[PDB]
Each structure stands twice: as structure tokens, then as C-alpha cells.
Amino acid sequence: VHTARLVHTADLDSETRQDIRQMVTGAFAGDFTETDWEHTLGGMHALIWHHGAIIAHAAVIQRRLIYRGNALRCGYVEGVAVRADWRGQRLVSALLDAVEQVMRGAYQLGALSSSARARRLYASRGWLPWHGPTSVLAPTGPVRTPDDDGTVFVLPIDISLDTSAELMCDWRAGDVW
Amino acid sequence: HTQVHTARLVHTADLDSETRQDIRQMVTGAFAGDFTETDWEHTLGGMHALIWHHGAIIAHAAVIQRRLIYRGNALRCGYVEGVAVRADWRGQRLVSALLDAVEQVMRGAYQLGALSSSARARRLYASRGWLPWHGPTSVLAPTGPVRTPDDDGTVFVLPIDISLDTSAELMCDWRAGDVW
Numbered sequence: 001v002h003t004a005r006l007v008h009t010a011d012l013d014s015e016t017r018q019d020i021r022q023m024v025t026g027a028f029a030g031d032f033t034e035t036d037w038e039h040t041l042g043g044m045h046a047l048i049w050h051h052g053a054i055i056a057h058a059a060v061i062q063r064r065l066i067y068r069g070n071a072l073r074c075g076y077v078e079g080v081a082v083r084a085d086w087r088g089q090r091l092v093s094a095l096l097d098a099v100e101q102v103m104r105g106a107y108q109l110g111a112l113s114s115s116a117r118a119r120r121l122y123a124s125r126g127w128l129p130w131h132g133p134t135s136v137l138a139p140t141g142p143v144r145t146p147d148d149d150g151t152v153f154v155l156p157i158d159i160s161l162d163t164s165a166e167l168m169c170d171w172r173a174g175d176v177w
Numbered sequence: 178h179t180q181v182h183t184a185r186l187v188h189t190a191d192l193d194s195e196t197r198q199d200i201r202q203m204v205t206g207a208f209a210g211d212f213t214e215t216d217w218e219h220t221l222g223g224m225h226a227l228i229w230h231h232g233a234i235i236a237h238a239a240v241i242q243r244r245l246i247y248r249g250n251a252l253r254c255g256y257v258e259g260v261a262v263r264a265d266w267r268g269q270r271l272v273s274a275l276l277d278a279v280e281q282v283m284r285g286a287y288q289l290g291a292l293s294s295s296a297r298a299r300r301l302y303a304s305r306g307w308l309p310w311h312g313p314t315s316v317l318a319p320t321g322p323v324r325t326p327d328d329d330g331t332v333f334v335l336p337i338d339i340s341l342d343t344s345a346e347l348m349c350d351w352r353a354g355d356v357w
């Protein structure tokens with residue numbers, strides 16, 4: 001059994017920070033860009049090592065998601081990756097056990113964007129698929145992000161959420177979800 | 178002999194119920210009761226620098242993650258909230274101990290540190306390298322940008338290896354309550 005360790009970005013020593021960046025970049029099935037790397041920073045990284053090398057990573061960063069006029073405090077998951085030689089060993093579950101613990105202890109909900117493949121994993125853990133329109137609060141005002149519809153999942157922490165409502169994330173460069 | 182007290186850094190998620198209550202009670206006292214439900218919410222989500230005495234919290238500061246828009250870019254910011262030292266523990270350089278811990282988190286995780294300062298606190302922040310923001314401040318509210326003129330002249334920034342022109346506009350992201 002593997003258990004993930006939660007390390008804040010600030011506690012990533014240089015060697016470890018570089019190892020995570022390259023592992024995630026080399027494992028992500030999406031096109032993981034420099035801006036996607038930047039989106040993994042600022043919060044808590046769930047890490048698993050094997051004999052000195054990083055083999056699994058998931059970060060949970062803090063942002064706001066606006067739901068019916070309220071800017072909810074969100075733990076957003078980024079950069080979930082397991083090194084190719086370590087897949088099939090339930091490491092993703094271990095990473096999610098760690099970031100969900102952070103959500104329960106610090107946020108009003110967790111949220112993430114899922115690969116269509118991975119949808120079943122998140123649903124099996126209790127995450128709910130968002131059905132309403134997603135959008136981002138851009139500098140010009142709200143902008144709908146339909147390409148992201150159907151990819152967002154939420155893990156409310158003791159709050160109710162009508163998942164058919166709009167969910168508007170806050171702005172950043174690159175992929176907003 | 179020199180007496181040195183230092184802060185321990187604890188994530189919100191690792192604060193147990195008793196500690197959350199003690200922090201909230203102490204911060205409330207430090208602000209003479211002016212610490213609202215939303216002010217408390219704003220201290221949650223990130224790292225808290227904590228100093229105790231006899232098991233009671235005597236100093237607190239939080240650094241939470243948010244974005245501040247500068248020159249069209251949403252900078253990754255560590256924003257300081259809830260800086261407080263219990264009134265019987267002043268003059269012992271505990272604010273400096275708190276800021277040593279807060280600034281360590283900023284340097285390791287963010288592009289800049291930011292905060293809104295009381296008039297009396299301006300001197301210590303500047304002395305530590307914090308730069309007063311001179312340009313107009315705004316918030317990216319849900320229907321678009323809104324100027325926050327009452328907050329002009331109160332925001333300080335701690336750039337982390339990026340050079341900032343403090344005469345530019347600075348627009349924080351949205352939240353309930355005090356946006357800055």
C-alpha cells in the first residue's frame with residue numbers, strides 16, 4: 001500500500017520540484033504545457049515516491065468558483081499523473097485520498113476537469129459531474145467555456161449544489177478549467 | 178540574552194477544531210471585535226503562521242492563494258490575511274516572526290506577495306521590502322472590472338523575482354466581503 005504525502009509548493013526542494021515537473025509532463029495524456037505547470041503551483045502537492053523518484057502527483061490549488069452569485073472557496077485539482085511504469089497499482093486512489101482530505105479540511109468544494117476516460121473513476125469516488133454551463137469570469141466579464149462542459153466534476157463539502165446551474169471559474173492564463 | 182520566538186506553518190486543513198477556535202478568538206480580540214464571518218473565511222485555504230504560549234495562540238498570520246491582474250496577466254499571489262498579535266504580547270517582535278514565516282511561503286510558491294495595510298502597519302512592511310502600490314486598484318467583479326478607490330493607497334506588494342511597476346493598475350479577483 002502506498003500513501004501520498006502532502007507537500008506545499010513552498011516546501012518543494014529544487015530537485016523534487018524539477019522531478020515532479022518532468023514526470024507530470026511526461027505522463028499527462030493531455031498536452032501539458034508550461035502554463036499547465038504554472039497552474040499546479042501555489043497549493044498542496046500529493047506526492048508518492050519510489051526509491052527516490054517521484055512516481056505519482058496531484059496538486060490541489062485554491063481558487064474561487066462562482067455559483068449563483070457566491071464565490072465559493074475551491075480546492076481545484078491539477079496535474080494528476082502516475083508514471084507509466086507504475087499504472088494499475090491504485091496510486092491514483094492514493095493521490096485522491098490526499099487531496100480530498102485537503103478539500104474537507106480547507107474548502108467549500110473540490111473541483112477538477114476530467115479526461116472522458118477518467119470520468120468513471122471520479123464518479124466512483126462520489127464526485128458529481130457538472131451538467132450546467134461552465135464559464136470563466138474573464139477581464140471583459142463572463143465568457144462561456146462550452147468546450148469544458150461535460151469535463152468538470154465537483155466534490156461539495158457539506159453544501160448543496162444544483163449541478164444544472166452555471167459554474168463560473170476565476171481567470172488565469174491558458175486553460176481556465 | 179536574546180529571546181527569539183518563531184512561528185510554525187500549518188495548513189488550514191491541518192487545524193483541528195480547538196485550534197481554529199483559538200485562532201479566531203485571538204484574531205477577533207486583536208481587531209477589537211471587528212473581524213467578520215467573511216473576514217474569517219478570507220483567512221482560510223492556505224498556510225497559517227502560528228505562535229503559542231502555554232498552549233494558547235498568541236500570534237497568527239495567513240497567506241492564501243489568489244490572482245492579481247497586472248499588465249494583462251493574472252499573477253499567482255500569496256495574499257496576507259488576519260495578521261494579529263495578542264495585546265499582552267506586543268513589543269516582542271512577534272509581527273516580524275510572523276512575516277518571516279509568511280514571506281518564506283511567498284518566496285517558495287508565488288509570483289508576488291500582497292496585502293492591504295492599516296496606516297500604522299505601513300512602516301514595518303516598507304522596512305521589510307514591501308512596496309506600496311500607487312496605481313489605481315480595482316476588482317474583477319462578476320459583471321466586469323469595478324474600481325476600488327477606497328482601497329487606493331493601502332495595498333503593498335512583495336515581488337518574487339519579477340519586477341513590478343507600482344504605478345500600474347492592479348486588479349484583484351472577486352470574493353464576498355472586503356475584496357482587498
